[PDB]
Subunit: 221 residues, 2 copies
């Protein structure tokens, strides 16, 4: 996806993906969610906590709507021996997520071959697995690519004769808002595609894939 940016208005962050699941009855199973470990580029460090916190809050609501109780844990090691015996399964999220800045590209418009652009470009991916902590049975695993978003920070057009002109003078000192807008729009897209994935994969059928065997092993009667 390729998106324009603005020097006038910075697009607000909007880390929310509407979920429409009818409240199921309580199934008395408890699931754990570990703090995600998404490593990010330096430009994303001011945002990643807001991003992760929203994601975890929304994923928690998927499980709750489907009738599970949900507990949060720092990491795998935070589950003591009794926790592991009791918990149905645990969701772990890991990721490598970055935005590369100030890339110059030709726009690839055959009708406009003199148009080039300065872009920010996303890169990386996030990986989910839902596993039973005693046995390491993988109940469900899935992933999402997030390196598919490009925001044009500055578009320029060469003169028919080549050489220098007002457009192709790139002055970063005038682009601060475009560049903030780029990061915000990419973040909003990356949030939506991760959450769409989560909603699509965290279904009753996938969550319950090994319910009988897990409940037998754990003595859940």
């Amino acid at each position: 996806e390729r998106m324009k940016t603005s020097s006038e208005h910075v697009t607000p962050l909007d880390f929310n993906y509407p979920i429409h699941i009818v409240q199921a009855p309580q199934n008395h199973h408890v699931v754990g969610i570990l703090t995600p470990r998404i490593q990010v580029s330096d430009n994303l460090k001011p945002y990643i906590d807001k991003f992760q916190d929203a994601l975890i809050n929304q994923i928690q609501t998927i499980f709750e709507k489907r009738g599970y109780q949900v507990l949060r844990f720092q990491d795998e090691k935070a589950l003591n021996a009794q926790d592991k015996r009791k918990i149905f399964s645990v969701l772990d999220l890991k990721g490598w997520v970055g935005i590369l800045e100030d890339l110059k590209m030709n726009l690839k418009d055959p009708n406009n071959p003199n148009l080039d652009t300065l872009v920010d470009q996303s890169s990386g991916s996030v990986w989910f697995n839902f596993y039973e902590p005693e046995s390491n049975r993988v109940v469900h695993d899935f992933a999402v690519e997030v390196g598919t978003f490009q925001a044009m920070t500055y578009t320029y057009k060469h003169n028919n004769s080549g050489g220098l002109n007002s457009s192709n003078s790139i002055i970063h000192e005038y682009l601060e808002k475009n560049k903030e807008d780029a990061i915000h729009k990419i973040l909003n897209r990356m949030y939506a595609v991760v959450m769409k994935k989560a909603v699509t994969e965290l279904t009753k059928e996938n969550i319950d894939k090994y319910r009988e065997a897990i409940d037998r092993m754990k003595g859940f009667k």
Copy 2:
């Protein structure tokens, strides 16, 4: 691509991609190559200098075989005003390249549904552009995805009845060699796909895309 690993033999690093280009005559143009800026995950920090150094050395030989002289520069700012007037165009490489460790996945074998695996998984991408530094004319740009490689560090098989068994006890204290092997094999694959890309795109026709206009602007007679 999904690859096995070994606890016996760590696959040597092999950052070399054979290039077969007949030495063209000297064209008296000079190109610049900037030090690449590939940001990597912490597990790749011991390797990235070796990786980048090899890539740059091989890309330099592509341009030289095609008849260009090649100069190296620290960054865009290292090109003084006279350098920018003289240099034909400059190649910049940026990337976001990581390996996520210890992911648990079901193997997706319908004939073997009890087989799960611990994997290292690559993630990210690298972005090339070749641009004329005075005008910012993008001569050629291209990119390569590198998040497509998975190395199985430990494969395990659940008993038909579920529960615990010798296989599904995951003991990281025994996996040091498998994990070193994983990183080395992924790095070798990522090198080969980046270099294949570079060879495919850094052709005489793409390098010379704006030769006349650039030479006219610069007074190259």
